[model samples]
Target chain A: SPWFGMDIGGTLVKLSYFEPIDITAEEEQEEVESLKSIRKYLTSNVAYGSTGIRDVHLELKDLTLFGRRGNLHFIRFPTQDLPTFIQMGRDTVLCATGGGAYKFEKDFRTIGNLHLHKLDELDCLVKGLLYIDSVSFNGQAECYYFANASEPERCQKMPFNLDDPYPLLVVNIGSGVSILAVHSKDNYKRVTGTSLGGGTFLGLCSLLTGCESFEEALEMASKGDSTQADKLVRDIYGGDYERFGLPGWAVASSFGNMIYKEKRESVSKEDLARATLVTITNNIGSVARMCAVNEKINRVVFVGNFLRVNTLSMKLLAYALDYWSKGQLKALFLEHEGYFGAVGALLGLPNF
Target chain B: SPWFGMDIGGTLVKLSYFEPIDITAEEEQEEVESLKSIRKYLTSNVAYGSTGIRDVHLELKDLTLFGRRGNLHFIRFPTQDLPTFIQMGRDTVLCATGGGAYKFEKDFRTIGNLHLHKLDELDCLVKGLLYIDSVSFNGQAECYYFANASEPERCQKMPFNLDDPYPLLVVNIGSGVSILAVHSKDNYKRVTGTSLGGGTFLGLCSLLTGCESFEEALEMASKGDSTQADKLVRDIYGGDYERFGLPGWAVASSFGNMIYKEKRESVSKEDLARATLVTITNNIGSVARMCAVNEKINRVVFVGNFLRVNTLSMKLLAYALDYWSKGQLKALFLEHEGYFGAVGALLGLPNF
Candidate 1:
C-alpha cells in the first residue's frame, strides 16, 4: 500500500508518497488492485493531469519508514487543480498539513471513503525539515550554504551540518512567510511572518510583466537588470549614503523609479520581473535577518517553494544576511525546500 | 535677510524659509531689495511655477531662530525641477540636507554667489523633529497617535506627549525607509531600512492603476477593498490560524489572489491601489516592529512625506503595531512629518 502525506497551501499542493520497496510476499499478495493502481500511477509518471509534477531529483531511495523500507517520492500540483484531485480521490486515510488541508477538508470528505487528518503547518515544517536533514539526501548533505556569498564569482554552495539544530530560525517562505524560532525538536514557536512572499513575487510579476507562470517570471528575471527598474542608493545619493554604510548599488526603493512616467515607460518586462524578484527576496531576507538577530539565532534556514529553483534569491539572501550581519548570520537551505510540510504530514501518519 | 534650509530628495525638494517678523525699521531699511523681493515672492505665493507648492498649513508662526523672531514657511517642488531652482539660487549661505544635498552640490555650486553647506539628513531629521515637537504646532500638540487603533469606530487622532523622548525608534518612511534607534539627541543609529517604501507604493500604484500622483493613488485606495486583491488567512485556512493568532481577516499573501487570471481580470485598479497601500504600509510596520523589538524600544515615531495626508496608512500602521506588539509598542506621528529634515537643515544654519 502507498502511504501518503499532503500539504495543501494557498498556491500549490505538495504530496509525499512512500512506496514500500521491501514488501514481503504476504504483504504484496494482500495489496488490492485499487491500491496497486494508485501506487503504480504515482510512481511510473513524472506528471499528473496538467500540473502535477513528481520531483524525481528529490526522491529518496531505500528510506525506512513505519518499519518498512521504501522510496520516498515528492510531487506537486497547483492548488487550483485540487478539485480535480479531490474528484479522483480514492484515499483511505491521509495526513495533511498547511491551510489547504482545512480549506479542502469538506471536498476531501465528499469522497465518502476518504479520511482527512489535519496537522499544523509550522509544526509539520519543523518535523519534516529535521527529518529530511537527519536522513540526508541519499548520503549527500541535505543542508547547504553559499560560501563567500558577498563575492558572486567566488560564491559556491557548500554543505552545512545541522546536527545540533537548536534555537534555529526557520523562515518558511511559501505563499506568505512564517518565521519560527525552533529551540528543539519539540519546542518551537512562530515568531512572525509577512505577506510579501513568493506569491507576491509571482502575483506582482504576472500583473506587471504579463508572465503566466513562476518559471516564466524567473526566466525573465535571470536576464533582466533590476537596477533598470529599481531606484538605487546612487540614484538618490549620487553614490553611497556613506554615513550609514549603504552602498551606491543598494536599492533605496524597490520600483521607486517607476513613479516617474518616463522611467516606467522605459523599463522592460524583464526588468520589472527582476525588480519584483529582488524586492520580494530582499524583503524576506531583511525580515529573516531581523528575526535571527531578535531570536539570537545565527543559522537562518529558509525553506518553502519560494526558494524552489530560486537561485538568484538564495544568493541575494545569502549576501544580504552575510553583509548585514557582518558574517555573524548564515542563510542555510535544504534540498527538499517545499516538501518539508508534506513530509512532516506523512511522518504524522503512523501517529494518526 | 531671508534664511533658507533645504532638503532636496529623490522625488521632492523641501524648503524651510524663515521670514523674520521682527525686522527693525533700521534692519528693514538695510535689507537689500533682492532679499526683500525673494522673501515676498515666497510669502505671497502658495504655488511656484508648475510644480512647487508652499504647504501653507504646515507653516510655523512666530518662531525665534538665530535671535530673530520669524515665521517659518514650508515649501516643496519636484526634484526634476531642481535646475530651475538652482538657477534661482541667490543665496550667500544655505544649509542643505537629504540625498539631494550631495547630488546637487555641483549644480548648487553653479551659482557662484551661493555657498551650499551640506548637513547629514538623519542628523537634521532628529534635530528638526525634536525642535518641532518642543515648539508644538501653533499651540496644538505636534505629536499624536490613533486612539483605540484596533477599533475602527472609536479610533481618533489623540495628542501624545514626547517630552521625555529617548530610546525611541524613528521610522522615516520616505521614498525608502530608514529606521533609526534614537538613544538620545546625538546618540542615534540607523538600525535598518527597507527599499519597499512610499516610493514603491506610489510607483506600483501608478504602474498598476495608471494614477498620476500620490494623491490620486491614495484616493483610489480609500475607495477599494484590499481583500479583493490580497489573499487573506481565511481565504487559505478557511478561518483564523488560531495556533498562531493570525486572524482570518489578516493578509496571508499580498496580491496573492492576483496570480489567478480570473481574479486579475475582475480586480479594479482601485483594488490594486488599495492592495499596494496595504502591502507597503504593513511591510513597513512589520519591519518597524522587528526593529522595535530588536532595539528594545517601544515608542516608534513615524515621520516622512509618506505619512503626509495619509491617514489610512496611519490607522493601519497604528492597528498593526498595537495588534502585533500586544500593546507593547506605540505608533506616533508628527504634524510636521515631511518638514523635519528641511527644518533640521534649517536648524544647522547656526553651526554652519
Candidate 2:
C-alpha cells in the first residue's frame, strides 16, 4: 500500500509518498515494481523538492489517505499542535510526531479527523524507517558524510555496530541542538539541548561574520578566520602558534582574528569560516559525549540542518566525537534530517 | 630596618610590614605591634610601618602597585592579562600581577622584561593576618557550618585553622573562573577554568540587562527575577518548573530562557537579573565541581569580585555548590578575597 507522508519539522518539511495498489481477489497476478533509495527520494517542501517528490504529489487539500485504492499512512515527527488520528475501519493509518500529534491535538482533529496516531519525535523517525526496511535503521544515508570529504564517501556502511546499542544518543544539530537518547531502541529520553547549536553557527556567524545560511557559514568559514578567536601557543609563547596545539607561525586563532591581533581586519575570513564551523561542531560533540558518557551510551547520531550538505560541521563533529570518546564512540548522521515531523504528518491519513 | 609589604591581588590587596632592628647581640628585645585593620590606619597609602614573626609579608609600596608608591602596587582582578611570575625580582622594584606571576614562566627574566619585583597577593593576606594577631588569620576569622545545607543557615565558628585545608579547590572568580588546587600546607596547583565565569556574569549583565558595575549586577539580582531571560520548566511544562530542576514556585531558572516564553512581557527586568546571577553562579559551581571531581579536591575557597559583598551572589553560589556536591564539598569565602594574587607577588620578595 502506498500513501503520502510529510514531516513538518522545526526547520523544514519533508515529503514522501508511495503508490497504493488495489488488493483485489479477482486479480490472479501482481506486478513487481521499482526499487529506490528512500534517502535520495527524501524531498523538502522548500529547498530541494521542486523536481522530485513535489512534482509527484503536491496536495494542500484533504489529502485523500485512500485517494487511490490501497494506501496506508504513517507519520513520524512530533508536534505540540497537531490533531488526533482519524481511524478508518480495519485499515489503521499510523501518525507519529513528538508534538504535532499530541500537543497540537486540535489541528489534526479539524483536518483529516480520522486516522491512528502516535506521538514522540524519535518514534516517528524510527517508525518511518522501520516501515520501509531493516537496513534503513542500520546506518546513515549517503549524503551524511564528512565536511571536506565528498558525498560519495558518505555512501558507505555506517554506524559500525558491535552490538545493539542501548541508549543511543541522537543529537539533531539543526537550528539548535536537540538531544534524544533511545534507551532501549524504543524509549526516548530528552537528554539535553543548547540554543547555540544550529542557529548559533548560522545566526552567530551570519550576523557577526556576515554569512547568510549554514552553507554560507561554511563557505565564509572557508575564507573567514577562526584565528581571530582561537588562541595559539605562540600568542602565549612569544608569538608562536604551537607548543600547546598550534605549531610556531601557525594562525592558531578564533573569533575573526581576536587571537593574534585585536581587530578583525588583520585576520583572514577563512579562519573564521573554518573555525566557527569546527568550534560549534566540536562543542556539540563535547556536549554529546558528556551526555553519552554520563548515560553510558556508545553511539551518537547527529541529525539536522547544521550537519546537512554543510559537510564541515559533520566532519568537525565527528572529530570531536572521536577525540572525546577515544574510539569508544561512533558519530552517525542522517539524510532526511530536519523534516521528520512534516514527513510523519504526510504519512498519516488522519481521520476526519 | 622596616620593610612594609603590600600585596594587591585578584580580589583585594593585603599589606604587612616587618622591621629589622639594629640591636646589640645581647640587647633586650621587644615585639613590634602593627595596626589591627591596616586598611583603616592609612587611607590606602599615606604611611605604614611594623614588625613580626608572621606568615607571608611584602613591602607596602607593592600593595598600591597600580596607584604607585615605592613599596605598594596593585593589579586589577581577572588577571587574564597579568604577566606571568618569572618577573618578580629586580635591582629596581619590579611590579607584577595575578597568578600569571607564577603559572607561565620557567625562568624569572622571561616575564615582562625581567623586572623581578612582585607582590604575592595570597601571601600578603596571610602575613597581614599575622601582623594583626587579635584579628589575624587564625584568630577570630569565622566559617559558616551550614554551607552544605540545601537552604543555607550560617553558624559561624571562630579560630579557623588557616593552613588546615588540604587538596582544597580555590575559586578565584575575578572576571572568570580561576581555580587552583591546594594540597598539604603550602603547596598549590592551578587545575581548571571556564569562560562562563564572574566576568561573563558582570560583563553580559552590564551590557544586556543594563546593570552598572559588578556590584550593581549582583544587586539587581537581589531585587530582580531570573525567569525573564531564563527558561523555566513552567514555561515549557504548562506550570511545573521542576521538570528541569527549577523550583515549582521559586525563581531559579536556566540561561537564555531556552524554555521560557520569549513573548511573555511582565517580569523581564527581574528575570534578566536573576538569570544572570543564577547563570554565573551555577556555571561557577559546575566548574568548581568539575575541578573537584577531577582532582578529588573537596574544599573550595571562592574569592573574587564576582563574590562581591553582594548578598544574592553568595547565596546562589553557596546553594549551587551545595546542591552539585551533595554536601560533600565545602565552599569557603575569604575577606579581601580579591587580592591574593598581588599579595602572592609581595611575599615572593628577594627569592624566597
Query: Quick one: best TM-score, which candidate?
Result: 1
Candidate 2 residue runs with Cα over 4 Å from true position: A1-103, A106-134, A137-196, A199-223, A226-283, A289-300, A304-306, A309-312, A320-352, B1-193, B198-281, B287-305, B309-313, B321-337, B340-351
Candidate 2 Cα lDDT to native? 0.47
lDDT of 1 by residue, A2-29 (tens): 6888999999999999988997899889
Model 1 accuracy (lDDT, Cα): 0.92
Stretches of candidate 1 off by over 4 Å are: none
Best by DockQ: 1
Q: Give lDDT tens digits, candidate 1, residues B122-210.
A: 89999999999999899899999999998889999999999999988999999999999999988999999999899999999998999
Alpha-carbon deviation at A340 in model 1, angstroms: 0.7
Please give each candidate's TM-score: 0.99, 0.59
lDDT of each: 0.92, 0.47
Model 1, A71: alpha-carbon shift in Å? 0.5
How close is chain B to the truth by TM-score, in each candidate? 0.98, 0.63
